[PDB]
């Protein structure tokens, strides 16, 4: 449907902007905070969002599409992350790369757990 392409595009654009802004304010090549920040904040909120959308499967399409598929899809990035990690590898700093990759991976997974948990907690 055409509403949906719009729902996504809006969220995607908002998230993408926020990520980019974060990336200006926080992000060096040595250790990319702005990226990780966005990826983790994103990881958290998607845990929340998923818990809310299972518990209310009645809600209309545009919400999940705009929140999750749009906003959180644009707020977060694997592309940038990958390029930054490879950058580190290429620089020779394998420790750092591993660190950034573990941070980014473990972190996001954790966040998503705490985001799920925060909702399961606050509906009991």
């Amino acid at each position: 449907a055409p509403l949906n392409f719009i729902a996504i595009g809006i969220g995607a654009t908002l998230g993408a902007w926020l990520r980019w802004v974060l990336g200006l304010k926080l992000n060096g090549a040595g250790w990319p905070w702005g990226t990780l920040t966005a990826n983790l904040v994103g990881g958290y909120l998607i845990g929340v969002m998923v818990a809310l959308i299972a518990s209310h499967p009645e809600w209309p399409a545009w919400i999940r599409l705009a929140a999750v598929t749009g906003f959180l899809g644009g707020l977060t990035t694997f592309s940038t992350f990958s390029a930054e990690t490879v950058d580190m590898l290429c620089r020779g700093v394998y420790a750092t790369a591993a660190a950034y990759a573990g941070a980014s991976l473990a972190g996001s997974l954790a966040m998503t757990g705490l985001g799920l948990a925060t909702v399961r907690l606050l509906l009991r």
Partner: protein
Amino acid sequence: SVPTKLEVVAATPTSLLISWDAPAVTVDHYVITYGETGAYWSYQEFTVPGSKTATISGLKPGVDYTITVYAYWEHMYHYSPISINYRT
């Protein structure tokens, strides 16, 4: 071929002073990357802005180090680096 030239001006056997001159183009920051030439797991790193001189510490004396300066103009993009092999 960026931060051109690039050289080492300092002593102690545990420390080292790099300096370069990198007018046009524009650099957001430099990343200095150093380790014992051989073992790649030893390599460490730090970041300097658009200034033009750095200082490395906590080196093992009499050891073959390899310093690289990467000149980044915009987060993930950088002009080709310069390296130096130097014994402390």
